[PDB]
Design an enzyme around this catalytic site. Structure first.
Site, PDB file in Angstrom:
ATOM      1  N   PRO A 157       0.796  -1.226   0.000  1.00 18.59           N
ATOM      2  CA  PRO A 157       0.000   0.000   0.000  1.00 18.59           C
ATOM      3  C   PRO A 157       0.828   1.275   0.000  1.00 18.59           C
ATOM      4  O   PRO A 157       1.952   1.325   0.512  1.00 18.59           O
ATOM      5  CB  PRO A 157      -0.808  -0.108   1.299  1.00 18.59           C
ATOM      6  N   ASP A 158       0.257   2.302  -0.610  1.00 18.58           N
ATOM      7  CA  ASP A 158       0.793   3.644  -0.528  1.00 18.58           C
ATOM      8  C   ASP A 158       0.276   4.237   0.765  1.00 18.58           C
ATOM      9  O   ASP A 158      -0.894   4.602   0.853  1.00 18.58           O
ATOM     10  CB  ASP A 158       0.367   4.477  -1.737  1.00 18.58           C
ATOM     11  N   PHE A 159       1.136   4.321   1.774  1.00 10.81           N
ATOM     12  CA  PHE A 159       0.678   4.714   3.101  1.00 10.81           C
ATOM     13  C   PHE A 159       0.231   6.173   3.117  1.00 10.81           C
ATOM     14  O   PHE A 159      -0.327   6.642   4.109  1.00 10.81           O
ATOM     15  CB  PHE A 159       1.770   4.480   4.145  1.00 10.81           C
ATOM     16  N   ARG A 160       0.472   6.884   2.018  1.00  9.70           N
ATOM     17  CA  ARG A 160      -0.009   8.254   1.876  1.00  9.70           C
ATOM     18  C   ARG A 160      -1.424   8.282   1.303  1.00  9.70           C
ATOM     19  O   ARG A 160      -2.162   9.239   1.522  1.00  9.70           O
ATOM     20  CB  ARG A 160       0.941   9.066   0.999  1.00  9.70           C
ATOM     21  N   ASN A 172      10.287   5.018  -2.890  1.00  9.21           N
ATOM     22  CA  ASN A 172       9.864   3.820  -2.184  1.00  9.21           C
ATOM     23  C   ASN A 172      10.962   3.222  -1.321  1.00  9.21           C
ATOM     24  O   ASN A 172      12.151   3.341  -1.628  1.00  9.21           O
ATOM     25  CB  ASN A 172       9.372   2.755  -3.176  1.00  9.21           C
ATOM     26  N   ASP A 212      10.583  -0.119  -0.251  1.00 12.90           N
ATOM     27  CA  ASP A 212      10.235  -1.542  -0.253  1.00 12.90           C
ATOM     28  C   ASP A 212      11.277  -2.494  -0.860  1.00 12.90           C
ATOM     29  O   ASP A 212      11.109  -3.703  -0.787  1.00 12.90           O
ATOM     30  CB  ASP A 212       8.883  -1.751  -0.975  1.00 12.90           C
ATOM     31  N   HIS A 232      14.212   8.491  -0.399  1.00 14.42           N
ATOM     32  CA  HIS A 232      13.632   8.445   0.938  1.00 14.42           C
ATOM     33  C   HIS A 232      14.233   7.310   1.757  1.00 14.42           C
ATOM     34  O   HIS A 232      13.673   6.898   2.770  1.00 14.42           O
ATOM     35  CB  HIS A 232      12.106   8.311   0.841  1.00 14.42           C
TER      36      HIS A 232
END
Ligand code: L55
Ligand code: ZN
Length: 288
Positions: free
Chosen positions: A44-47, A107, A109, A126
């Site tokens: 998931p895109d936590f944003r 990302n 991940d 990031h």
């Protein structure tokens, strides 16, 4: 130049971008990618909203005093599998085809690495879970994700084997600077770029989003994303897809996987991409 000069794309379409890519004018491609390229991998895109205070769990100051929340959240959010998407393997094909200058990712991940991009190919703007470090300045012992994973699932706060300081994943917490590598590579890479491929990012997080303004004025920029992004905010260089002065920016709107498949198909790469993905996915599925 800008819209005043003769443009590199013969038309502002995916088809125009493909012809440009297979011309001698296009040799070096920079990819700018975000959470949108990993959602189809079940990350998931936590944003994305559909996915003391809540913001404390990502703050570096709070983490160093109270790391248990973060690592608890890390266990819950830990992906069940790491199977990169068609979009990821498309970037591997770019690398194989000799076209990839760099992939700048937001990302954490590690799917770019799993898909076969090497450290030299990557700017993890990031940070990343791929490595972790002891937080003590005089130590900074590096730990692999295999080590960090075991700590996270065992629910043991990771401590350094050498000095018993906290060990932190190499992600950029709030309050931390972006990696120096981000700024050093930006300075060199955007002197050399023939094409920007912007995939799966809304370009709303800074300074990552400002990267599109670092491209030379002539450099085409292809956005593959569910929604148009990168256009200057009417309230607050920027993307111009649709005006009379549009000359180099192209938006392909849909899932990143489907856009990359469409582009690969135009390039005559569809069979290669299919074969690569099915082979690597099979390999990942068969991990014992
Ligand atoms: C646990 C785990 C392990 C592996 C290998 N992958 C994953 S991916 C799934 C997941 O969401 N994992 C996960 C787990 C916890 C937090 C977050 C994302 O939220 C954070 C956390 C720390 C820092 C930031 N900061 C930034 O992004 C930032 C800082 N500065 N700027 C400009 C931006 C955001 C993601 N998750
Ligand atoms: Zn240490």
């Amino acid at each position: 130049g800008a819209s005043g000069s003769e443009r590199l794309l013969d038309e502002l379409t995916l088809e125009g971008v493909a012809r440009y890519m297979q011309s001698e004018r296009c040799r070096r491609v920079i990819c700018l990618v975000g959470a949108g390229i990993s959602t189809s991998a079940g990350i998931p895109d936590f944003r994305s909203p559909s996915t003391p205070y809540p913001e404390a769990i990502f703050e570096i100051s709070y983490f160093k005093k109270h790391p248990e929340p973060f690592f608890a959240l890390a266990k819950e959010l830990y992906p069940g599998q790491f199977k990169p998407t068609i979009c990821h393997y498309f970037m591997r094909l770019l690398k194989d085809k000799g076209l990839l200058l760099r992939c700048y990712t937001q990302n954490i991940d590690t799917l770019e690495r799993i898909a076969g991009l090497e450290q030299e190919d990557l700017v993890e703007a990031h940070g990343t879970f791929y490595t972790s470090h002891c937080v003590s300045a005089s130590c900074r012992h590096e730990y692999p994700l295999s080590w960090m994973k075991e700590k996270i699932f065992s629910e043991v706060t990771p401590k350094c084997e050498d000095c018993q300081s906290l060990v932190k994943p190499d992600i950029v917490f709030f309050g931390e600077s972006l990696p120096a590598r981000f700024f050093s590579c930006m300075q060199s890479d955007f002197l050399k770029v023939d094409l920007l491929l912007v995939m799966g990012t809304s370009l709303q997080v800074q300074p990552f989003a400002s990267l599109i303004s670092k491209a030379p004025l002539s450099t085409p920029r292809l956005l593959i994303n569910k929604e148009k992004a990168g256009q200057s905010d009417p309230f607050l260089g920027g993307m111009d897809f649709d005006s009379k002065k549009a000359y180099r920016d192209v938006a392909w709107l849909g899932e990143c996987d489907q856009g990359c498949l469409a582009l690969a198909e135009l390039l005559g790469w569809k069979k290669e991409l299919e074969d690569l993905v099915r082979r690597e996915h099979a390999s990942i599925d068969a991990q014992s």
